[PDB]
Design an enzyme around this catalytic site. Structure first.
Site, PDB file in Angstrom:
ATOM      1  N   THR A   1      37.280  33.669  41.628  1.00 51.74           N
ATOM      2  CA  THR A   1      38.465  33.232  42.412  1.00 51.74           C
ATOM      3  C   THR A   1      38.877  31.770  42.521  1.00 51.74           C
ATOM      4  O   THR A   1      38.075  30.890  42.635  1.00 51.74           O
ATOM      5  CB  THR A   1      38.374  33.709  43.823  1.00 51.74           C
TER       6      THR A   1
ATOM      7  N   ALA B   1      35.363  41.518  47.200  1.00 53.48           N
ATOM      8  CA  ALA B   1      36.642  42.189  46.960  1.00 53.48           C
ATOM      9  C   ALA B   1      36.918  43.257  48.015  1.00 53.48           C
ATOM     10  O   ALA B   1      37.981  43.266  48.635  1.00 53.48           O
ATOM     11  CB  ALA B   1      36.660  42.806  45.569  1.00 53.48           C
TER      12      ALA B   1
END
Ligand SMILES: [Mg+2]
Ligand SMILES: [Mg+2]
Ligand SMILES: [Mg+2]
Lengths: 195, 204, 240, 212, 230, 244, 222, 235, 4, 231
Positions: free
Chosen positions: D1, D49
């Site tokens: 990310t 996630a």
């Protein structure tokens, strides 16, 4: 979190708290106010484990404000510090303890005296003329031992405080992005904007 | 991370002729860092005196707890608690936390108001009562205190002489311990007068 | 645990325990709420069969729930303390989670919900209390006045009264209060509130309490002399 | 990310990458890391996630319940605090989250709150979160002005994610842009790094380290 | 969290044209000590099912009691307990599989590997495996422990896929099972010579054979082997 | 089931009154009178013992006046056993506050909590209320000297002078007549005894049928002292005012 | 110390077309270096035109499928026999998975079917409930072998129009059911060659508006 | 006394029957369902002129596609609405979709009989639950404290219910427009109300597929009242 | 265990 | 009289009046019929409305693919009991991979209703149920009463004027029992049976409710235009 200092002078208590919030190799914020007003004449600064600090501070704030409304009366700094100590003393034997260290600066209106209390996460309370938490003390205490006098003015206290911040900025490994300074006296709590 | 030696401190108690003495240092620290030189470790409930060494948060908590309990005792009993009874109360309260103990080394001292007998006692962190004719020691310089007391102590000392003995025991013991010192207080206790003296000692 | 259903329906569809709780409110000392253009005033009766009282320490009839909201009541005094305590706790809890003080409507809705819960919970009787809740929403200058009752219903009022002889003072307010033009100032609002209590009270000495709430947490209680001046002024205009 | 969001004259820019990784395995290149909590509120996803996806959709349900009960859209402060108080209850259990609650309201104006799984909650103008946050900060800090145009600010947010996507091995895929205004949030497209890099290289003259 | 104490080794099984065969030795090992020799590890349920169990014997005896209780419970308020509403192999397996998975999910497993062999009411062969993890699978041949490594290869030479099942008689199937048990005695250090064997046929029903021995062994070539090299 | 035998102790009458509270007050009206008078420099507590027997041990007895802490005391009117349950709870509450804040509990806070306990018994639990009325006499640094009363309803009020128990109507009229604000403790002592002497159901008021206490700042410099009067001290104060 | 997890190997694959979707998976079940079964299905018809597979630790896989099948049953009872849409099933499965966040189902879950516009849909899940809709997803032991092949052949990655200087991409188009099955079969035969836990047999479930159809193919058994 | 969950000799639960009498004392609420939408209207009935009528909240939103009107002991409805809202939002969280109107109603009605010696008594309030979903379209439900719910084309509840229901019997047909339904609710409310109907003592609302649930303004209703009076005078 |  | 205050009290003649009053709630309920052959089992139910503007109260509920019931009396109580049956059927399938026998279904309902008749505070169920199903021993029809009594029958009816349909089925017993492999004819017999319980009203398209289960037929319900065939 990291640096919180406190100095009690003749007529006021001065708290200084670092503005940096660091997570990993990134300074996420450089304007963080590490303090909460508990009552008009009582201020608490805090440092320690992320999340725990603010959660604890706001929880204490809510309880003191609740007391104020119920009794239409302001608790003394001594009374507030004892309440805070007990909460931390409970916490240390809990499943997950609050890892938060605090300074409580207050002006007792009945005694007309400033008061500074130092409380660590274990619930270890002491009343002091000057105080610090963490590695800050290892530089400031010896400096204050030398230069501090009990009859100092607020302006003299601020200069004494500048001397501490300068020493920390020189010898501390980490950049803490300066400090927010707040004064507690008979007229309540106010912030020094230019430091 | 040894709870009994984070803050540091010492307490000693001694008996004399129709009197008792209890003394303590004033240091409170965080390991190497000295934090406070005003931290008194001796408290009293009526005429019964309690000294407590060890983890400072527990020292404060237990004082507040025994004030709580001796106040309710007095209201219900309509009389002040005696040293022998208080000693048992301390023992019970500590053992109640057998598998999650207060990290302390308490020391009871006082004179029984009915019999006039001088009384001292000591405890481990979980309540084991250590009664003694002569002296009780506690804290991070307990080894040093045991050595000083065992050599300096003699029975039936007068209040003025007893003061010198207990003071010299504490001072010289504290100066061989890094985590003890930074001032000292001595309580001399007679049947119906109590004198409190602050001692001059080296501040390192 | 004690489980008995005390609040239940009767053949005619009434819940007598709720209705009897209203009778306890009817017995209580009169309480009146009037809201002006820029303020709300809460007036309260204090019965004068009690002399040798200590007014310093005696519980006041009007209670601060937060710095910007107040609560008065009629009915059982002991019952009211429980509602006031819960309200004060919720006010602090709201500040803690929402980071904003309660609205007057929200605080009222909470108190009313507590009252309602006691009308269909086992082993409890309803609160013998009706409340007037007044104040100003955060960063708002519109006056708010709400009423609650034992059943749990609540609503907003331009002006309202509760307690003994409340039907008389409600009659007075219904012809003396103009919706198109509410009391423009603090003085006008207090005077109308005092006037309405003087229809019922007896003497205007230490029988009437007045509390004025203004925007931004500006609440103050009037003293004896301050109230007595309104009483003296009204009586002189009456003789005409 | 790599995720960022910043405040400026024209509101809030929100930009995120779209890569998911299980160790060194590239699981996905098309992950939605901006969660559309509601038409007025955006949440960014970094760390776990599932943790992020589950609890931020849950957050949306709590925000909907607020406006039903209170007849008024929830504040950014209150929304962020519901999430932070939730994760704080789980503290120590092993939740992994680095989020940013972004929104615009009348009483607050444009507001950004950083919220993470150890309970931290910070109001701020600029935040970058994720394994490539430092790369995004570099470009963002050295190029940010409050007076940026809506057009320029959109590019800087896009260019910052691209910088991280390039250098950080665990950031990439595509860039998702958002603009947040009073009126609500507006989507500004999915931009594949495959084409976006060469387009930026050629037009800007940057990325000279790379064999052209 | 457990550790097994008294243990049983391989259970082996296969399908044939009209039914299923299952076998297991009569040993209860205590580590390296071959402690108990009279241990029956095949347990019939009704006249149509046999449950073969390996692993911890204390847990096996617990499972015996559960199956025993299941037969009792099924008979309650059930006029067709010995007919249409009798216990099927599929019912017995699913019950055990449920229990095994629930126990692993509570981190307190029954330390066993189980094979349920039987014939359904419609004549279909039933053969399915379940273990301490709650893992389940079915195959023409099934075996636990060492049997999985040594027996399965031999049994798969007879029945390698589904289409080989109709072509395999009970005589050929039993011969392969008995051969496999011999190979396990040669090569498994926690096996015994004595074993039990069960046949569940759709025509002839349940045949339970006790006190069988491994025989026709090859050892004579050992005399020619001298030293370890030179 | 057990519904049949339930008295329903926490319900309203058609008129809106709490049956059990009203009946508990009726019980208290037959109990020995207790008076509290607040002066500018102290508080007096006076109470009449219920029809005494000559063989009752008077000196080692406690029926009416109880100590809650060093700064607060209560006079009791009603069932003594009920009062002691509440008194012990009040004593514990005071110590909890001291433990928490390191300050002696303010009088009102102690009174409110004790009154809140009484309130609970009238609203839930299905238990009978406590048949007890208290007069609270205490001092703190906020309001100074304070008198309060609480009754089974859990309602409490503040007073300059107040009576509970028997003949409160007659007692309150007499107190209302002779009381004034600039009064001293020694005057209040006289008023308390004179009031009991006229309202008593006995033939004549004597030392053995009384309990007495004062809360003065009559100690040495800025500190409060509680004086629970001994039998001989009551005998002397009764002669000094000319009642016997 | 008792280890509550195991690895049963095998690999699964889901592809979505225009008006159809496929969910394929090999039939081999293993532990360590042994074969448990050559034919143990792990792709299931769950009703409402939804096919599902939960690959990894088989015990957790069977438990999850069982619970979802049951979830479909109760959805009908509680909502007047309403058809459970693929998007609703996906969200439901997230809550099933995240319900055991602190003792997870050790499986990679894939479901396939048709969306409410009649277009092919594939959803993929992580062990703790993170999910996403995709045209293409391979899961299980050989996912790392198959997935980059699909990126190249389904989504046409790294392929440019000849003669265009790598300027214009090869454009995306929907594949026919015939073309998809070719890619599935070639994906599994390649995975069978280079992964020891993959082989024996291939079972493909195809989903159209007409229903769920099955196809079976042999794989290498070594 | 007697048990709370007792049956009468006629086979009815005393407490449920008695709660129905409380609902008859309540203010009138009317609902009409059309193919263009569902309309919900209520009598506010202020007890005094000083009471600010706009604070009277007898029509309430449950979700964007479901609305609700009430009659009887309205305080009892708060926990019913709270449950309905939670049920609606929870279903959206679990299933990423809107919840069916019938399934919402069934969830509310499950609370009804959860009383005895659970809550101490039944609810003293009836609810008209109106909404739209993709499967069954525009729907109106009458939820009682008995735990029973009927679907209605049109339904009145409250003090003037039997008179208003008879009027709805004659007036309703399957081709009613939304505007026709709005006027019809106003007409029938004006007939059964004690005080004269206006925009302050009555409130209208509706639910449509396109715009969802909407409570009408006092300005919007006032024009519909004026439109209604003109049309009745026009023949 | 998918990360972002 | 003095013995009907709760379910825990016996009358002097040994009666339980609260159970009998619960039984009375069934008599007030709308008629529903049940009958079976050797291959199929059928439920027919007359639905009731509040008025012409209202819907018709649904009487039939599905419990599993092979089992379901019809109700008469308090509908919410039926919902509770049917929900319990759904769970018990489901438990049997998940744990034992076994379809729940209709006889065991009856035994479970009996024991659930019984506990409500022997304890203080609770009340009996106020609903009667007709359970049909097809299991390993063929077709089954059960009658449930809230007293706890469950009875297996070839045919029956419960509700208002149920005696007419019950008499008819008693006459027709020999005929309808042998309607094997013919669903429509078995329904026709059930529709003719329920017609013997009609007064002033007749069977219309949104009034009639039919359900069937059998050898090669899952439990399915017919309403609306799907029952127009049988009028
Ligand atoms: Mg030293
Ligand atoms: Mg030193
Ligand atoms: Mg091989």
């Amino acid at each position: 979190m990291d640096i919180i200092l406190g100095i009690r002078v003749q007529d006021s208590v001065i708290l200084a708290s670092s503005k940096a919030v660091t997570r990993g190799i990134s300074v996420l914020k450089d304007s963080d106010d590490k303090t909460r007003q508990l009552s008009p004449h009582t201020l608490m600064s805090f440092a320690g484990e992320a999340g725990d600090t603010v959660q604890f501070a706001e929880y204490i704030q809510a309880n003191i404000q609740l007391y104020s409304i119920r009794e239409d009366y302001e608790l003394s700094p001594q009374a507030v510090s004892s309440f805070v100590r007990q909460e931390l003393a409970k916490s240390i034997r809990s499943r997950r303890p609050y890892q938060v260290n605090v300074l409580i600066g207050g002006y007792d209106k009945k005694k007309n005296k400033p008061e500074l209390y130092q409380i660590d996460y274990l619930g270890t309370k002491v009343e002091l003329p000057y105080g610090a938490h963490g590695y800050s003390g290892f530089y400031t205490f010896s400096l204050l031992d030398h230069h501090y006098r009990p009859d100092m003015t607020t302006e003299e206290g601020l200069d004494l405080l500048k001397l501490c911040v300068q020493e920390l900025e020189k010898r501390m490994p980490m950049d803490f992005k300066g400090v927010i300074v707040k004064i507690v006296d008979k007229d309540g709590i106010r912030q020094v904007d230019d430091f | 991370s040894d709870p009994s030696s984070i803050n540091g401190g010492i307490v000693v108690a001694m008996t004399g002729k129709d009197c008792v003495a209890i003394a303590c240092d004033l240091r409170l620290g965080s390991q190497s860092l000295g934090v406070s030189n005003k931290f008194e470790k001796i408290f009293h409930y009526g005429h019964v005196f309690l000294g407590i060494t060890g983890l400072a948060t527990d020292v404060t908590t237990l004082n507040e707890m025994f004030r709580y309990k001796t106040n309710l005792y007095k209201l219900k009993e309509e009389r002040a608690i005696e040293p022998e009874t208080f000693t048992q109360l301390v023992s019970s309260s500590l053992y109640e936390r057998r598998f999650g103990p207060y990290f302390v080394g308490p020391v009871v001292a006082g004179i029984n108001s009915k019999s006039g007998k001088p009384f001292i006692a000591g405890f481990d962190l979980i309540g084991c009562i250590d009664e003694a004719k002569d002296f009780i020691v506690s804290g991070t310089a307990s080894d040093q205190l045991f050595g000083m007391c065992e050599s300096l102590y003699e029975p039936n000392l007068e209040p003025e002489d007893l003061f010198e003995t207990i003071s010299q025991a504490l001072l010289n013991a504290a100066d061989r311990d890094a985590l003890s010192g930074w001032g000292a207080v001595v309580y001399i206790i007679k049947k119906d007068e109590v004198v409190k003296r602050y001692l001059k000692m080296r501040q390192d | 645990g004690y489980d008995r259903a005390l609040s239940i329906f009767s053949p005619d569809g009434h819940i007598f325990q709720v209705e009897y709780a209203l009778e306890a409110v009817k017995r209580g000392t009169c309480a009146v709420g009037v809201k002006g253009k820029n303020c709300v005033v809460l007036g309260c009766e204090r019965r004068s069969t009690l002399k040798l009282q200590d007014t310093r320490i005696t519980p006041s009839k009007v209670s601060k729930i937060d710095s910007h909201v107040v609560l008065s009541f009629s009915g059982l005094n002991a019952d009211s303390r429980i509602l006031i305590e819960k309200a004060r706790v919720e006010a602090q809890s709201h500040r803690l989670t929402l980071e904003d003080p309660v609205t007057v409507e929200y605080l009222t809705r909470y108190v009313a919900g507590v009252q309602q819960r006691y009308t269909q919970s086992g082993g409890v009787r309803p609160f013998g209390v009706s409340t007037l809740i007044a104040g100003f929403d955060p960063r708002d200058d519109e006056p708010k006045l709400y009423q609650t009752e034992p059943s749990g219903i609540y609503s907003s009022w331009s002006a309202q009264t509760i307690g003994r002889n409340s039907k008389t003072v409600r009659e007075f307010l219904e012809k003396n209060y103009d919706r198109k033009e509410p009391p423009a100032t603090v003085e006008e609002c207090v005077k109308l509130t005092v006037r309405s209590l003087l229809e019922v009270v007896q003497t205007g000495a230490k029988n009437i309490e007045i509390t004025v709430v203004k925007p931004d947490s500006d609440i103050v209680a009037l003293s004896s002399e301050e109230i007595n001046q309104y009483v003296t002024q009204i009586e002189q205009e009456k003789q005409e | 990310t790599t995720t960022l969001a910043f405040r400026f004259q024209g509101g809030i820019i929100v930009a995120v990458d779209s890569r998911a990784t299980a160790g060194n395995w590239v699981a996905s290149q098309t992950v939605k890391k901006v969660i559309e909590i509601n038409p007025f509120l955006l949440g960014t996803m970094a760390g776990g996630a599932a943790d992020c996806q589950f609890w931020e959709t849950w957050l949306g349900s709590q925000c909907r319940l607020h406006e039903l009960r209170e007849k008024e859209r929830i504040s950014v402060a209150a929304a962020s605090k519901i999430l932070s108080n939730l994760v704080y209850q789980y503290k120590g259990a092993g939740l992994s989250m680095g989020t940013m609650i972004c929104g615009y309201t009348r009483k607050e104006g444009p507001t950004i709150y950083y919220v993470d799984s150890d309970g931290t909650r910070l109001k701020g103008d600029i935040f970058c979160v994720g394994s490539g946050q430092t790369f995004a900060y570099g470009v963002l800090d050295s190029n940010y002005k409050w007076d940026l145009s809506v057009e320029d600010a959109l590019y800087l947010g896009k260019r910052s994610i691209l910088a991280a996507a390039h250098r950080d091995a665990y950031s990439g895929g595509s860039v998702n842009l958002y603009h947040v205004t009073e009126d609500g949030w507006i989507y500004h497209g999915n931009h594949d790094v495959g084409e976006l890099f060469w387009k930026v290289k050629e037009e800007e003259g940057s990325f000279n380290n790379v064999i052209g | 969290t457990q550790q097994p104490i008294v243990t049983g080794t391989s259970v082996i099984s296969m399908k044939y044209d009209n039914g299923v065969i299952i076998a297991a030795d009569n040993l209860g090992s205590y580590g390296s000590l071959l402690r108990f020799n009279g241990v029956e590890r095949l347990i019939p349920v009704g006249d149509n099912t046999v449950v073969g169990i390996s692993g911890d014997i204390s847990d096996m005896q617990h499972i015996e009691r559960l199956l025993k209780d299941l037969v009792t419970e099924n008979a309650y308020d059930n006029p067709l307990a010995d007919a249409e509403e009798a216990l099927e192999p599929s019912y017995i397996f699913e019950y055990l599989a449920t229990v095994m998975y629930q126990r692993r999910s509570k981190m307190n497993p029954l330390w066993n590997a189980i094979i349920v062999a039987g014939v359904q009411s419609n004549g279909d062969q039933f053969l399915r495996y379940v273990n301490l993890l709650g893992v389940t699978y079915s195959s023409p041949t099934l075996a636990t422990g060492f049997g999985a490594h040594m027996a399965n290869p031999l049994l798969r030479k007879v029945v390698d896929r589904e289409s080989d099942i109709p072509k395999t008689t009970v005589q050929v199937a039993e011969e392969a099972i008995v051969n496999a048990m011999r190979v396990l005695y040669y090569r498994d250090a926690r096996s015994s010579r004595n074993f039990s064997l069960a046949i569940i046929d759709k025509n002839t029903g349940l045949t339970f054979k006790k006190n069988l021995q491994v025989e026709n062994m090859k050892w004579d070539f050992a005399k020619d082997i001298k030293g370890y090299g030179t | 089931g057990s519904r049949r035998y339930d008295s329903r102790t926490t319900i309203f009458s058609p008129e809106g009154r709490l049956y059990q509270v009203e009946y508990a007050l009726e019980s208290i009206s037959h109990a020995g009178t207790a008076i509290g008078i607040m002066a500018s420099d102290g508080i007096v507590l006076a109470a009449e013992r219920k029809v005494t027997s000559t063989l009752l041990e008077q000196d080692t007895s406690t029926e009416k006046l109880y100590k809650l802490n060093d700064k607060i005391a209560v006079a009791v009117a009603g069932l003594t056993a009920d009062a002691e349950i509440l008194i012990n709870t009040a004593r514990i509450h005071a110590q909890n506050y001291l433990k928490t804040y390191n300050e002696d509990i303010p009088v009102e806070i102690l009174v409110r909590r004790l009154s809140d306990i009484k309130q609970g018994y009238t609203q839930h639990g299905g238990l009978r209320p406590f048949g007890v009325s208290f007069i609270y006499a205490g001092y703190d640094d906020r309001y100074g000297y304070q008198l309060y009363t609480s009754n089974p309803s859990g309602n409490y009020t503040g007073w300059k002078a107040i009576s509970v128990g028997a003949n409160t109507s007659a007692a309150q009229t007499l107190l209302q007549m002779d009381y004034k604000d600039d009064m001293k403790v020694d005057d209040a002592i006289e008023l308390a005894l004179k009031t009991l002497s006229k309202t008593t159901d006995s033939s004549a008021l004597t030392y053995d049928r009384l309990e007495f206490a004062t809360i003065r700042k009559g100690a040495n410099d800025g500190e409060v002292y509680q004086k629970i009067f001994k039998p001989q001290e009551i005998k002397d104060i009764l002669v000094k005012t000319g009642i016997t | 110390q008792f280890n509550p997890y195991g690895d049963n190997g095998g690999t699964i694959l889901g592809i979505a077309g225009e008006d159809f979707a496929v969910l394929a998976g090999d039939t081999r079940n293993i532990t360590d270096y042994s074969i448990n079964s050559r034919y143990e299905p792990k792709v299931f018809d769950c009703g409402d035109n939804i096919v599902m597979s939960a690959n990894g630790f088989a015990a957790d896989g069977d438990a999850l499928v069982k619970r979802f099948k049951n979830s479909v049953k109760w959805y009908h009872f509680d909502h007047n026999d309403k058809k459970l849409s693929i998007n609703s099933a996906a969200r439901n499965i997230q809550h099933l998975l995240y319900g055991k966040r602190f003792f997870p189902y050790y499986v990679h879950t894939i479901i396939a079917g048709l969306d409410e516009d009649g277009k092919g849909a594939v959803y993929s899940f992580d062990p703790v409930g993170s999910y996403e809709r995709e045209q293409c997803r391979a899961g299980g032991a050989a996912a790392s072998l198959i997935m980059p092949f699909l990126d190249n052949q389904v989504n046409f990655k790294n392929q440019y129009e000849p003669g265009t200087n790598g300027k214009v991409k090869k454009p995306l188009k929907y594949l026919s059911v015939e073309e998809v099955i070719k890619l599935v079969r070639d994906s599994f035969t390649s995975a069978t060659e280079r992964h020891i836990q993959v082989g024996d047999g291939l079972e493909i479930l195809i989903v159209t508006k007409d229903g769920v159809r099955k196809e079976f193919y042999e794989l290498k058994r070594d | 006394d007697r048990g709370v969950s007792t049956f009468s000799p006629e086979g009815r639960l005393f407490q449920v029957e008695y709660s129905l009498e409380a609902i008859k004392l309540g203010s009138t609420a009317i609902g009409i369902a059309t193919k263009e939408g569902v309309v919900l209207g209520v009598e506010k009935r202020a007890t005094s002129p000083l009471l600010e009528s706009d604070s009277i909240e007898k029509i309430v939103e449950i979700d964007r596609h479901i609305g609700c009107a009430m009659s009887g002991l309205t305080a009892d409805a708060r926990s019913m609405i709270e449950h309905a809202r939670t049920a609606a939002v929870t279903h959206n969280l679990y299933y990423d979709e809107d919840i069916n109107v019938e399934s919402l109603t069934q969830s509310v009605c499950d609370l009804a009989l959860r009383f005895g010696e659970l809550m101490s008594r039944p609810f003293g309030v009836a609810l008209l639950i109106a909404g739209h979903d993709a499967d069954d379209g525009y729907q109106l439900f009458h939820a009682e404290p008995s735990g029973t719910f009927y679907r209605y084309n049109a339904k009145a509840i409250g003090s003037g219910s039997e008179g208003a229901q008879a009027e709805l019997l004659n007036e309703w047909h399957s081709s009613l427009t939304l505007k026709e339904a709005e006027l019809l609710v106003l007409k029938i409310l004006k007939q059964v109300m004690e005080e004269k109907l206006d925009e302050n003592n009555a409130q209208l609302s509706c639910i449509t597929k396109q715009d969802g649930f909407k409570i009408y303004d006092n300005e919007k209703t006032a024009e519909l009242i004026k439109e209604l009076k003109e049309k009745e005078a026009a023949e | 265990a998918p990360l972002x | 009289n003095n013995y009907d205050g709760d379910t825990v009290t016996f009358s002097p003649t040994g009666r339980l009046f609260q159970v009998e009053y619960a039984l009375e709630a069934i008599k007030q309920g709308s008629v529903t019929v049940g009958l079976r052959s050797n291959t199929h089992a059928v439920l027919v139910a007359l639905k009731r409305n509040a008025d012409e503007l209202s819907s018709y109260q649904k009487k039939i509920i599905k419990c599993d693919e092979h089992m379901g019931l019809s109700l008469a009396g308090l509908a919410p109580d039926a919902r509770v009991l049917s929900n319990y049956l759904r769970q018990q059927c489901n438990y049997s399938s998940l744990v034992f991979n076994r379809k729940l026998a209709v006889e065991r279904a009856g035994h479970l309902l009996c024991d659930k209703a019984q506990k409500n008749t022997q304890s203080y505070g609770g009340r009996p169920y106020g609903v009667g149920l007709l359970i049909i199903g097809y299991d390993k021993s063929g077709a089954h029809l059960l009658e449930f009463q809230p007293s706890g009594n469950v009875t297996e029958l070839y045919g029956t009816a419960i509700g208002a004027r149920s005696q007419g349909a019950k008499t008819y089925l008693e006459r027709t017993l020999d005929t309808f029992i042998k309607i094997d492999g013919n669903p429509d004819e078995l329904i026709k017999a059930g529709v003719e049976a329920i017609s013997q319980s009609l007064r002033d009203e007749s069977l219309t398209v949104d009034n009639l409710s039919i359900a069937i289960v059998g050898k090669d037929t899952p439990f399915t319900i017919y309403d609306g235009e799907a029952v127009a065939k049988y009028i």
